[PDB]
Ligand binder design. Sequence first.
Ligand SMILES: [Zn+2]
Ligand SMILES: [Zn+2]
Ligand SMILES: [Zn+2]
Length: 178
Amino acid sequence: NSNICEVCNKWGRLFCCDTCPRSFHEHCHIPSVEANKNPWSCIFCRIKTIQERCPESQSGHQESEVLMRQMLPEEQLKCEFLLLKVYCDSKSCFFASEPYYNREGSQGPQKPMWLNKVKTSLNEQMYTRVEGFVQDMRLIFHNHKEFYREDKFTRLGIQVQDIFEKNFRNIFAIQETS
Ligand SMILES: [Zn+2]
Ligand SMILES: [Zn+2]
Ligand SMILES: [Zn+2]
């Protein structure tokens, strides 16, 4: 097994996957690492199994169809993994916890949003369709762009949104386009 957490790249109290060499902090894994279960298989492994059990699941899909999917177990997992892929980027730190807004010339967003809120909402099964999760994720970056205006800090939202979108297209096998 690796000696650092796959998500945050730090050592510490790590839980090791039984079917691959990755390791995790308890609350870095999504869902949080399960109490018992020997062997234990990480989210990366669980996602790989879905693809292996249904190879045709990798054929191209339309985003509009993906968004309307109900949050059955496999879609729940895919959103958990997409969320985790964002937290894998160190720039996710800026979007993790509850923001506050007091900048001359800007007004805060009407609906603030942040990663840990999305994480809780997934854990509490508050999304009934993939669309709910994706909307909240895109809202994080849209709020940031609007608030920061011409400050160069706006670029951090563009950057982390790009990680989200690339991973969304990979995990849900969105049809490639020009
Ligand atoms: Zn970690
Ligand atoms: Zn694994
Ligand atoms: Zn099949």
